Structure 1
Amino acid sequence: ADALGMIEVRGFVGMVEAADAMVKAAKVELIGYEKTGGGYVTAVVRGDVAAVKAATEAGQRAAERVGEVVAVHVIPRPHVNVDAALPLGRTPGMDKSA
């Protein structure tokens, strides 16, 4: 599975800026955003480990100027159970080559 990048912000605007910067910096796909209430939202991007690493670093830098960044993290090889149980945009089995 592709690597996993996540930028959590207590602020929609900052999360949007994180997402925009990430997809512009590297070959990663913004698959969606998670809403957990209380003003907390998370931008999720996926791609190769190198791409997700470069995107996440750029997303953090730019979002920090506009909003309240809660967390920034990269998971190079997410477990298949994680992708199946959590909404991260790469449901196992969703593949034409499968």
Structure 2
Amino acid sequence: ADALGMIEVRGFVGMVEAADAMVKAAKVELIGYEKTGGGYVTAVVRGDVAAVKAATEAGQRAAERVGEVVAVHVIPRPHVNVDAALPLGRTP
């Protein structure tokens, strides 16, 4: 039920340093990562909105030094169907 936040970075390194800075910056739960092929990988964090949007900015700001940051977005409340089908942690 938590809110959502993601970063995807052409480069497994960029994801880690991004995924790191997110955890260190807020009280969010890092669920894992999803491999889309082609060198692109996506980090996934979950938690309250105020936490994520504060954590995510730290990720974007920290990966741009060492990565090709592709996209960064935040969903404050994913509709029930999303959590049900996609692997975003909070899956019954």
Shorter-chain TM range is: over 0.9
How far is 1:47 from its partner? Answer: 0.6
Match of 1:7, SS?
strand
What are the ranges of 5 or more consecutive residues in structure 1 without an aligned counterpart? 93-98
Q: How many residues align?
A: 92
TM-score (structure 2 length as normaliser): 0.98
4+ aligned runs moved over 2 Å, structure 1: none
CA displacement 1:35-75 (0-9 Å, x = unmatched)? 00000000000010000110100000001111111100000
Aligned position for 1:55:
55
In structure 2, distance between residues paired with 1:30 and 1:38: 23
**CA RMSD after TM alignment:** 0.6
Larger radius of gyration between Structure 1 and Structure 2: 1
What are the ranges of 5 or more consecutive residues in structure 2 without an aligned counterpart? none
